[PDB]
Design a protein around this nucleic acid. Structure first.
Ligand SMILES: [Mg+2]
Ligand SMILES: [Mg+2]
Ligand SMILES: [Mg+2]
Ligand SMILES: [Mg+2]
Ligand SMILES: [Mg+2]
Ligand SMILES: [Mg+2]
Ligand SMILES: [Mg+2]
Ligand SMILES: [Mg+2]
Ligand SMILES: [Mg+2]
Ligand SMILES: [Mg+2]
Ligand SMILES: [Mg+2]
Ligand SMILES: [Mg+2]
Ligand SMILES: [Mg+2]
Ligand SMILES: [Mg+2]
Ligand SMILES: [Mg+2]
Ligand SMILES: [Mg+2]
Ligand SMILES: [Mg+2]
Ligand SMILES: [Mg+2]
Ligand SMILES: [Mg+2]
Ligand SMILES: [Mg+2]
Ligand SMILES: [Mg+2]
Ligand SMILES: [Mg+2]
Ligand SMILES: [Mg+2]
Ligand SMILES: [Mg+2]
Ligand SMILES: [Mg+2]
Ligand SMILES: [Mg+2]
Ligand SMILES: [Mg+2]
Ligand SMILES: [Mg+2]
Ligand SMILES: [Mg+2]
Ligand SMILES: [Mg+2]
Ligand SMILES: [Mg+2]
Ligand SMILES: [Mg+2]
Ligand SMILES: [Mg+2]
Ligand SMILES: [Mg+2]
Ligand SMILES: [Mg+2]
Ligand SMILES: [Mg+2]
Ligand SMILES: [Mg+2]
Ligand SMILES: [Mg+2]
Ligand SMILES: [Mg+2]
Ligand SMILES: [Mg+2]
Ligand SMILES: [Mg+2]
Ligand SMILES: [Mg+2]
Ligand SMILES: [Mg+2]
Ligand SMILES: [Mg+2]
Ligand SMILES: [Mg+2]
Ligand SMILES: [Mg+2]
Ligand SMILES: [Zn+2]
Lengths: 109, 213, 51, 117, 112, 169
RNA sequence: AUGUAACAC
RNA sequence: CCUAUAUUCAAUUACACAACCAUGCAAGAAGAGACAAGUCGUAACAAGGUAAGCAUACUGGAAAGUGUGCUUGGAUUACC
RNA sequence: ACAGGUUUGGUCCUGGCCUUUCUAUUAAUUCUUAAUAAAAUUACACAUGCAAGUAUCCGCGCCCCGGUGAGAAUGCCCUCCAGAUCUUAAAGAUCAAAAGGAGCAGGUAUCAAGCACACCUAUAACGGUAGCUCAUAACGCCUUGCUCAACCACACCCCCACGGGAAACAGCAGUGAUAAAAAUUAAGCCAUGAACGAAAGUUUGACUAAGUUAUAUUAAUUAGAGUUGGUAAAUCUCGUGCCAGCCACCGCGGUCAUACGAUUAACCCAAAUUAAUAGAUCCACGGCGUAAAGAGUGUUUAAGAAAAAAAAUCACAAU
């Protein structure tokens, strides 16, 4: 790439960042349409607690519930954030614990 | 500025055209513009309430076209004075009326536009000028036998100083600048006031458009 | 005055150019004479063969 | 930006800090905001006394008289400041509120003398 | 003495693109512009219109252009001042002799 | 710059260290030159080296090249008043061309420091405002004055809420 | 022709 | 029209007109990816058991096979 | 970038992803007081209160301050200024429309042709030429305030506002809807600016002084948060046994877990600590036989380089 070609093509400029599953917003409010369990990939085997939610932006998404134990049924409102789950393909959202219809993890009693 | 994507707006020019046409068509007459309700002291046309310092003079005095409409030749060459100059100055101040056009919309014929020759403080100006504050309830009319009584004047010379001392620190720059260039003369610099004469507030301002020279 | 000095400088370089082109004209006449000798030799060589 | 009218004004612009004001002497347009775009900053005025007990004023004399000569209007505090400077004579508002302080403080002396008895 | 133009191009020099239209030549001015990433000067071309009253433009000339004070139209703001180099007929401004590239057409050291 | 035969001439120091500044009436500067022969060596070095510097110091002046039309290289200056200045180069070297142009039409040295002197009068030290145009922002920052309330808190007796409390009581 | 799915320095 | 001024009008006419798209849903069709496991074969990696591969045509459940040119990203082990 | 982790039984090279650094919003946990700075979900609809008045009547002001970024690649920089205002006999000063251009200016060429985008004449009209922009990016499409003493645009919508939808807070406060996003339906013109008046002076939800908020710095009145496999500072005992679960990447958990949950201990910040999302920064003046890259071949236009010196031309199977 000689000087004439670099003058013709201009300096290299960085591309803008692709928007994530939350469309650039940090959290999103959603209502739970369904809850289920989902299998992981090759290196490890489990069945993690996930949910299918209708978000406030109108798009329906798959989210993962962290922690151990939850009391969630349908028509519950949750707050989700853009953390991705490494084991599960297609899951790019995590419910934040301690907001709306979901609480923190319960200590054993 | 100018760009290659400018689009030909027509409605703004058309709206300015229709607005100018409508104000030229429905320009308000002076009678309906300046008719007054004498109890509320509130203008039916403009919605404005009169100031309280002009409250007494509305009920206690009549305007120029209220005192002029009964004159036989509709007041040409007549002298009309004002309560403002009568109360503040001992010297007579009067206007010699040149030409007057009333408005016909008033059923009592109490409104119009008038011109005249100015005499203020006894000094007579040589040009005709449209009369300001015709509509004020503050005008008075002199009699014919008192016309030459108010016409006669005793000219008094002015005792104001034509030159004053400078403000002190500006005077210090004048002394410093002449000492810098070597002017030995210690004469006191004097600010001259022949262009500083200020005509006071009740002079009527010129409502005619000034020609740019 | 700078226009006048520039005009004088251009005239001086013009005289230098004219003198040097006289030298190269003399050299070009020398090369023309030598090329004429070589052309005459090759023409007289080519004339014998066709005969 | 473009305005319909207005005039050139030499005035005081309030910048600075909370409970620590500062006025910049500013020759600008009349219709612009107080801290908006200006033509020329002439001087400064410190509203607070220093450790030396001085209120400190700076004026750019030639530019101020140039702007007044080409027709810049002045506001009441900057005419007060120029009157204290002596580039202009003393402002009659300073004159009258000075005599008002004389009358008020003399009346306070009389009231204190009556309240002593 | 008010004869001024609002354009920054008071005097420019351009190569003629074409003479298709009547009494006006399309000319192509070349300027040096600093590309700032490379810090290097390059040739930027721009198109202008110039009024030729005598129709003296052959395509390939180098033409001096002077700015008109009040433009006739939005695209013709310049006129020819001089034909600097006629195409194929180039006289040297130093010696006053016609030349063809590198070779002199007539020798300047031969007045007679 | 790694690319290029002479990479040093593409730096900001070389573009800024060339000192030829034309007069304000100068509009067009035209170089006719040849790429053959030992005579045009100085003109070719002039084109290869100094014209970026002159174009940097005169951004509004047009500079134009022409190659192989006239047997002798020359430079031609077109002014505002229709004035045409011809500088003929046939054997002059690059530095002699530089001093020759700077002596025929440049800017005088005294005009240069006076031009930057009325350029330096625009930034007066006594003004206040942003850092990009003025040296100081607060009057607080001056050593003898009141310190700024974001750094040193003010005494209570100066404070407006205490003034309102004492006025209301 | 084939032999899947849990190796750690 | 012996000072000098007053009023009017400013609205239509002739056609095309959801074509063009963008956003959601859908009877359905086709692909790709992921495929801790099932069935069918073993195509390729060793002259992978027919040397592989490219362009292209035909054929076959499927990897694929064959035909005409081209390549070594294959050897022929080198007084054989 | 002073770099580091990560491909493979293993080494070297190429090449992506992530960590380490700084700032801003939201959420979680915690929270003692002050000062300063800032208040930021919405061009969706608004109950109510105020925010333009002054002045001897005429007049003068009435998106001027202030609010917002919806639209437009709008635009930055530079010439020339009609017009408005101020002071004055002139003439100067400020704002500067419209008009342009030396130059700079988001992405996309899977937007490559646009379709009349042009010129003369002498009179402002008849007519005649076949023209104009464009691969150094026209004409299109998408997105967006910005290059910041600041600049541009909007005043419910139909780019405009004659007219029609229809009764307008994108003023200060506040209310619904919506959003992850939560300031007082508050005191004065005491100080500066603006408006008016000859003037004492009047008004000002601009502003000044406060109220609320860990949003950010400072001082102390204050002690909680995160983490302990490697990068990367720091772990002991129990319970579980590819289950529950954790992670930024490599990855760990399959009855002896420094990686899960709890306890002890330790590390690092601190009235803050993490998580998420945006930013700042970060790609090529480096390469093209084997890793991505020399396009199947030749000629030419545009565009360049000609820099010091020479040459074209002979058996054999071009077509
Ligand atoms: Mg995580
Ligand atoms: Mg909570
Ligand atoms: Mg809450
Ligand atoms: Mg402040
Ligand atoms: Mg099998
Ligand atoms: Mg095979
Ligand atoms: Mg075999
Ligand atoms: Mg096989
Ligand atoms: Mg085989
Ligand atoms: Mg077989
Ligand atoms: Mg093989
Ligand atoms: Mg094939
Ligand atoms: Mg077969
Ligand atoms: Mg067969
Ligand atoms: Mg092989
Ligand atoms: Mg061997
Ligand atoms: Mg690496
Ligand atoms: Mg590998
Ligand atoms: Mg490994
Ligand atoms: Mg919050
Ligand atoms: Mg009024
Ligand atoms: Mg604004
Ligand atoms: Mg658009
Ligand atoms: Mg303008
Ligand atoms: Mg003007
Ligand atoms: Mg926008
Ligand atoms: Mg609204
Ligand atoms: Mg509108
Ligand atoms: Mg509000
Ligand atoms: Mg609300
Ligand atoms: Mg907030
Ligand atoms: Mg709240
Ligand atoms: Mg709330
Ligand atoms: Mg109030
Ligand atoms: Mg006030
Ligand atoms: Mg006041
Ligand atoms: Mg904090
Ligand atoms: Mg496992
Ligand atoms: Mg954890
Ligand atoms: Mg254990
Ligand atoms: Mg760890
Ligand atoms: Mg643990
Ligand atoms: Mg690379
Ligand atoms: Mg390759
Ligand atoms: Mg090749
Ligand atoms: Mg190919
Ligand atoms: Zn401060």
């Amino acid at each position: 790439a000689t000087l004439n070609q670099m003058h013709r093509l201009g300096p290299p400029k960085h591309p803008p960042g692709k928007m994530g599953p939350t469309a650039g917003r940090p959290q999103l409010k959603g209502v739970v349409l369904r809850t289920f369990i989902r299998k992981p990939k090759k290196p490890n085997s489990a069945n993690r607690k996930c949910c299918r939610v209708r978000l406030s932006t109108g798009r329906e998404a798959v989210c993962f519930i962290p922690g151990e134990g939850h009391s969630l049924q349908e028509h519950h409102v949750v707050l989700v954030q853009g953390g991705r789950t490494q084991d599960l393909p297609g899951v790019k959202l995590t419910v934040v614990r301690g907001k709306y219809d979901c609480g923190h993890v319960q200590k054993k009693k | 500025m100018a760009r290659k994507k400018v689009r030909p707006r027509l409605i703004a020019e058309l709206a300015r055209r229709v607005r100018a046409l409508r104000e030229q068509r429905e320009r308000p007459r002076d009678s309906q513009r300046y008719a007054l309700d004498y109890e509320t002291m509130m203008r039916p046309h403009s919605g404005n309430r009169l100031p309280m310092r002009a409250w007494a003079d509305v009920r206690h005095e009549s305007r120029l076209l209220q005192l002029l409409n009964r004159l036989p030749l509709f007041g040409l060459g007549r002298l009309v004075t004002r309560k403002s100059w009568l109360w503040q100055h001992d010297e007579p101040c009067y206007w010699r009326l040149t030409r007057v056009r009333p408005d016909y919309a008033a059923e009592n014929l109490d409104h119009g536009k008038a011109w005249g020759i100015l005499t203020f403080k006894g000094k007579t100006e040589s040009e005709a000028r449209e009369i300001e504050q015709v509509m004020y309830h503050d005008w008075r009319l002199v009699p014919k036998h008192e016309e030459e009584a108010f016409t006669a004047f005793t000219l008094v010379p002015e005792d104001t100083p034509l030159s004053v001392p400078y403000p002190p620190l500006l005077r210090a720059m004048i002394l410093a600048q002449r000492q810098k260039y070597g002017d030995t003369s210690t004469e006191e610099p004097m600010l001259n006031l022949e262009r500083a004469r200020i005509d006071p507030w009740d002079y009527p301002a010129k409502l005619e458009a000034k020609t740019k020279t | 005055e700078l226009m006048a000095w520039n005009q004088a400088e251009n005239q001086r370089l013009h005289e230098l150019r004219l003198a040097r082109l006289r030298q190269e004209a003399l050299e070009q006449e020398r090369r023309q004479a030598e090329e004429a000798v070589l052309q005459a030799r090759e023409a007289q060589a080519w004339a014998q063969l066709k005969e | 930006r473009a305005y319909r009218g207005g005039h050139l004004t030499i005035r005081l612009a309030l910048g600075g800090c909370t409970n620590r004001p500062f006025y910049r002497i500013v020759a600008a347009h009349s219709k612009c905001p107080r801290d908006g775009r200006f033509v020329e900053q002439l001087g400064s005025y410190d509203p607070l006394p220093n450790s030396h007990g001085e209120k400190l004023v700076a004026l750019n004399f030639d530019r101020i008289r140039h702007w007044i000569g080409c027709g810049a209007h002045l506001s009441k505090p900057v005419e007060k400041l120029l009157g204290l400077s002596g580039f202009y004579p003393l402002h009659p508002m300073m004159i009258t509120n000075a005599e008002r302080l004389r009358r008020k403080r003399a009346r306070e002396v009389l009231l204190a003398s009556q309240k002593t008895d | 003495s008010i004869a001024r133009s609002s354009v920054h191009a008071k005097w420019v020099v351009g190569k003629v693109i074409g003479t298709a239209m009547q009494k006006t030549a399309k000319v192509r001015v070349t300027r040096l512009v600093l590309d700032p990433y490379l810090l290097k000067y390059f040739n930027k071309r721009k198109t202008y219109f110039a009024h030729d009253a005598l129709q003296q433009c052959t395509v390939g000339d180098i033409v001096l252009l002077k700015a008109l004070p009040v433009p006739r139209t939005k695209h013709v703001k310049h006129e020819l001042a001089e034909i600097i180099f006629k195409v194929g007929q180039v006289i040297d401004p130093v010696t006053g002799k016609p030349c063809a590239g590198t070779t002199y057409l007539e020798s300047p050291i031969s007045p007679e | 710059p790694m690319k290029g035969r002479f990479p040093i001439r593409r730096t900001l120091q070389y573009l800024g260290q060339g000192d030829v500044v034309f007069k304000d009436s100068v509009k067009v500067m035209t170089v006719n030159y040849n790429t053959h022969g030992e005579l045009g060596e100085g003109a070719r070095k002039f084109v290869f080296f100094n014209i970026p510097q002159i174009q940097y110091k005169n951004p509004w002046v047009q500079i134009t090249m022409f190659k192989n039309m006239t047997p002798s290289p020359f430079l031609r200056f077109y002014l505002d008043s229709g004035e045409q200045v011809l500088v003929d180069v046939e054997s002059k070297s690059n530095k002699e061309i530089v001093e020759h142009i700077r002596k025929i039409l440049g800017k005088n040295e005294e005009t240069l420091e006076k031009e930057e002197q009325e350029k330096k009068q625009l930034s007066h030290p006594a003004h206040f405002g942003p850092r990009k145009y003025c040296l100081r922002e607060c009057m607080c920052e001056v050593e003898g004055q009141v310190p700024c309330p974001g750094l040193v808190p003010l005494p209570k007796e100066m404070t407006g809420k205490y003034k309102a409390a004492l006025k209301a009581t």
